[PDB]
Enzyme design. Sequence first.
Site, PDB file in Angstrom:
ATOM      1  N   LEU A 159       0.826  -1.198   0.000  1.00  0.00           N
ATOM      2  CA  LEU A 159       0.000   0.000   0.000  1.00  0.00           C
ATOM      3  C   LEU A 159       0.866   1.255   0.000  1.00  0.00           C
ATOM      4  O   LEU A 159       2.086   1.201   0.174  1.00  0.00           O
ATOM      5  CB  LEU A 159      -0.937   0.006   1.210  1.00  0.00           C
ATOM      6  CG  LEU A 159      -2.098  -0.991   1.161  1.00  0.00           C
ATOM      7  CD1 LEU A 159      -3.179  -0.616   2.158  1.00  0.00           C
ATOM      8  CD2 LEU A 159      -2.671  -1.087  -0.238  1.00  0.00           C
ATOM      9  N   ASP A 160       0.214   2.397  -0.208  1.00  0.00           N
ATOM     10  CA  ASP A 160       0.892   3.682  -0.259  1.00  0.00           C
ATOM     11  C   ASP A 160       0.667   4.464   1.035  1.00  0.00           C
ATOM     12  O   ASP A 160       0.016   3.999   1.972  1.00  0.00           O
ATOM     13  CB  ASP A 160       0.403   4.495  -1.456  1.00  0.00           C
ATOM     14  CG  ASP A 160       1.049   4.067  -2.755  1.00  0.00           C
ATOM     15  OD1 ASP A 160       2.279   3.857  -2.768  1.00  0.00           O
ATOM     16  OD2 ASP A 160       0.325   3.941  -3.765  1.00  0.00           O
ATOM     17  N   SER A 161       1.223   5.677   1.076  1.00  0.00           N
ATOM     18  CA  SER A 161       1.011   6.551   2.227  1.00  0.00           C
ATOM     19  C   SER A 161      -0.388   7.157   2.214  1.00  0.00           C
ATOM     20  O   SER A 161      -1.018   7.309   3.269  1.00  0.00           O
ATOM     21  CB  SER A 161       2.074   7.648   2.253  1.00  0.00           C
TER      22      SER A 161
END
Lengths: 40, 178, 459, 88, 56, 70, 107
Positions: D42-44
């Site tokens: 996942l991303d930030s």
Amino acid sequence: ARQWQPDVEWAEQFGGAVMYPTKETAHWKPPPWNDVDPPK
Amino acid sequence: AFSAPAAYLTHQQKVLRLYKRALRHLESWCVHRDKYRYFACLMRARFDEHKNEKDMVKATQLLRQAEEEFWYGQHPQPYIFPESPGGTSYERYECYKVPEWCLDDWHPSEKAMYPDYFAKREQWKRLRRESWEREVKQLQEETPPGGPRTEALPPARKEGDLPPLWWHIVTRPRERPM
Amino acid sequence: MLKIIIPTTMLLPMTWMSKHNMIWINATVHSLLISLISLSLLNQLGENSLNFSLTFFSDSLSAPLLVLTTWLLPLMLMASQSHLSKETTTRKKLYITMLILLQLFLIMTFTATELILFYILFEATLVPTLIIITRWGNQTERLNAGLYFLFYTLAGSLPLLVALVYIQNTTGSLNFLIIHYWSHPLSNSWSNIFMWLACIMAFMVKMPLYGLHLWLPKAHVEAPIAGSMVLAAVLLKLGGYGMMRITTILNPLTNYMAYPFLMLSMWGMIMTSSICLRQTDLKSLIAYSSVSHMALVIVAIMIQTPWSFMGATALMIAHGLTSSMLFCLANTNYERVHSRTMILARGLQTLLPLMATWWLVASLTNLALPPSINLIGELFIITASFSWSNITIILMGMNMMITALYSLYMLITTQRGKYTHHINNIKPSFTRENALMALHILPLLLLTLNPKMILGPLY
Amino acid sequence: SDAPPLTLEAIKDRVLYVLKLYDKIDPEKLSVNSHFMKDLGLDSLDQVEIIMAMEDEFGFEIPDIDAEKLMCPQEIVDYIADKKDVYE
Amino acid sequence: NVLQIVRDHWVHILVPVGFVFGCYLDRRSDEKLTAFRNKSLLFKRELRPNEEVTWK
Amino acid sequence: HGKRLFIIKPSGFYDRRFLKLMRFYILLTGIPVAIGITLVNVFIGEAELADIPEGYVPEHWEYFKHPISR
Amino acid sequence: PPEPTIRLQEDPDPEDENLYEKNPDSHGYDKDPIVDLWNMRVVFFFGFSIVLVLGSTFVAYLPDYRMQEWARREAERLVKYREANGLPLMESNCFDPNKIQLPEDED
Ligand SMILES: CCCCCCCCCCCCCCCCC[C@@H](O)O[C@H](CO[C@H](O)CCCCCCCCCCCCCCC)COP(=O)(O)OCC[N+](C)(C)C
Ligand SMILES: CCCCCCCCCCCCCCCCC[C@@H](O)O[C@H](CO[C@H](O)CCCCCCCCCCCCCCC)COP(=O)(O)OCC[N+](C)(C)C
Ligand SMILES: CCCCCCCC/C=C\CCCCCCCC(=O)O[C@H](COC(=O)CCCCCCC/C=C/CCCCCCCC)COP(=O)(O)OCCN
Ligand SMILES: *OP(=O)(O)OCC(C)(C)[C@@H](O)C(=O)NCCC(=O)NCCSC(=O)CCCCCCCCCCC
């Protein structure tokens, strides 16, 4: 928690030749303790 | 709140803080869930179109026009959680919080009620008394010379040790004492 | 009048021959008995006065002041018991002796029938207060404070003495009854103007009048608790009593000589009240509030109407009780915290609820909540001032609002909010402190039931 | 009030319930200790949205300094428990 | 025990004795000013058959 | 549910004791005063106004109405 | 500089003493429990029971030496008489002019 009482720094303002020292008086010295001046 | 702060916020943290603030205010504008979902997906698409950019100068030129646009359209009455610093029940239970040391001033007829509680309290007091003498030296040797550089505290490293400066964090009054 | 004076004198040998551990008990019991005896002076007539002898007489202006003076002594003893625990027996007896001598001088001053006698006792009240302030005061500023409290007073009262003897060489008497019955108008003359100023300034400086009030915050914040109590409750009212007595020979000059002071009061009450809004010391705030109330009393006396005099008497009594209670509350905080700074000890309602109730009642009384006698005096003065000039309401109205603000400010900063975390030495309130507050506050609410007792001789 | 005294099991169940409705993460792969960036990729921004969903689910707000370092469901559960004073 | 508690509590008589002496002193002062007793134009009265003074 | 918890609070012993003592002493003297006032009102007081009989000079305390004031 | 950095021989500042520690039920009057209890008792008895109640009752029942009801009765009789004989209630002159000798101006 203690009552303030005078310390040495406070007591020293009354140890001069006079109160309110000035330039002219700055060289004055208190009299001797026994009020006797050396014969020289 | 719990985490120690740093000296500055990096660019990534500022961008993420803008993203959260903008989404919250967009939710405050779009009351209904489906409208909010649509416009939040649109805002996510608008946000990551410059995600892959490399240079700092224009990436900082962005997130400045973004702050200006946010401040122009910031919904002057945004939704606040009731316990949050602007909420309707922020410090509601602050008057029911009593420190632990007050129990030391109870009358013996009051401490006669609840004997088990006060026995456990005495155990806690003696534990604190020993751990403090250990903790002072642990913090003294673990600190760099010239003083601390950040207000972050170390854990315990020995077996019977406790984390330094733990008493007033562990013995918090409660979130809802009464 | 000797039935009150002689037991007060007998307090001294009783104090000095007492056991080392029984001075407070005996002093408190016998002071309370003397107060009960002095309660009988309240039976006054609508006629002239209670002229006991050639030397002493009592009036419905003097009787409430005498009762307040006799009642304040046991409260001062209770308040002083705490911080004088580690003091030698001889010095404790000297402290009690100073308090007794102050009470004796005040008693005689209120009942004296001669202006010169009144002046002598009015000045004799200075020596015990100065000794109390400069000997048992805590900080190093007390010495300076004492100097101020002395010289201001003397700077006002040395001309008065001159005027007094001058008057006795012209009228032939300084007896107040003869002076009242043989009064003659004062013609507009420079000599008469300076005689007016000499007769007025000594009482103005002790109220204190705005601009001559610099000694009061120093003296009240530097004094011990009993000194603050007696200074705020009784010694301020000496100027009001003196001006009420002496204005009978100053007419019709007062019609236009009162203008500079009236302004100085009407504006002054604003300034001091606003000063209370930005204050970091509790005692300093309470002292400035005293200055504002006494400015209102000055206006009342200068207006010279029946409603003005009634309001001034009622306000003097009410302010005495209220300011003494407020000083006692501040001191009960100070003895726990040792700081005397408002924002240090916070959120005390959570730790001391009954003391918070005492704080609320004292703040409400200082705020002049009806039907307290504080509001009775304030409203009578305001109505008289409105008759004097309809514009005065503006200033009066402003003062009212400001007063409430700072009063509630003092209540909110110390009692509400969150407690200070590192202050862990706040012990439960003692029975002595609670009894002190109760004995302050019950007489006020009792007096609201019979206001005629404190409305003076013009009721 | 009349609020039931939520427990650690309830907090964990609700956190996992909210995470399983996030179609970006496969319900088979995730666990209590499954990391956000490395385990699930996942991303930030995804982490910020997950924190916001947690806040909406539990009715209170997590400050950004604390929220930015909550990278597993287990630490989310621990944070909520410490904030709300959960015994068991 | 009498003759022992006296040495500690004889102090408690001073103020009441002062009160009685002050009342007695007040009475003495009153006698001196009787120059107009039963002589005022408002309260001028004829004496009762067994009355010497109107007030004391 | 046995989820009873300890409530941390300051001591109420001393405030309660002071209130009890103050009430006790005030009532100790005031109940007999109220009873005495009630008995005097029911059984004795409330003199009625009358004309002074000729040749009679009343005492100073005979010009007041309430028995306690008299 | 071999000075001790001590200005003089002085006692340290003592710590404040808690009255509750050595004596619960302390009442805050004295460190001696018996003297403390009796100080509490005498203060409460002579302040609340004696002065505050009995003195208040004494003040409440003070006889009417200010003569309010006497003035009311006198005013009632005067109003009755003046309404009966048609006199105009209060008169504008406090002293009747027959006994005042005004000065002739002759201007
Ligand atoms: C510092 C903090 C406050 C302290 C307290 C202040 C209160 C004291 C204020 C003194 C009150 C006023 C004093 C005199 C008032 C009389 C009215 C007179 O001054 O006004 C005109 C007078 O005109 C001029 O004022 C003449 C005098 C001018 C010189 C006086 C100095 C002016 C300012 C000085 C202020 C200094 C005060 C502080 C001293 C250290 C009226 O004209 P005129 O009809 O002809 O004279 C009438 C009087 N007669 C009938 C006796 C003849
Ligand atoms: C806490 C919970 C509640 C419990 C209590 C419940 C009961 C409530 C009652 C409390 C107040 C309610 C008001 C009821 C008033 C009734 C009493 C009132 O009527 O008496 C007043 C009387 O009050 C007193 O006069 C005032 C008290 C005296 C104050 C002196 C203070 C005592 C000395 C302390 C030292 C002094 C310090 C201050 C110096 C100035 C006025 O009486 P009055 O109609 O007129 O005439 C009396 C009867 N006559 C006609 C025969 C003469
Ligand atoms: C807090 C500090 C206040 C200081 C005191 C301020 C008040 C000053 C009042 C004046 C001082 C002297 C008063 C005089 C005493 C009254 C006696 C009197 O009135 O007799 C007058 C005498 O009046 C005077 O002589 C007064 C002259 C003034 C001399 C002293 C000056 C003092 C300072 C004056 C200005 C300041 C006054 C106000 C100060 C305001 C507060 C700072 C008449 O004299 P005869 O000659 O017998 O009659 C005339 C017909 N043949
Ligand atoms: O992997 P992560 O750690 O999550 O990093 C995320 C991200 C890579 C996107 C970021 O942290 C980052 O480092 N980006 C590098 C370049 C960069 O971000 N430059 C700035 C872009 S600013 C932007 O996104 C445009 C904002 C548009 C939205 C305006 C808001 C107005 C709303 C008004 C109120 C409703």
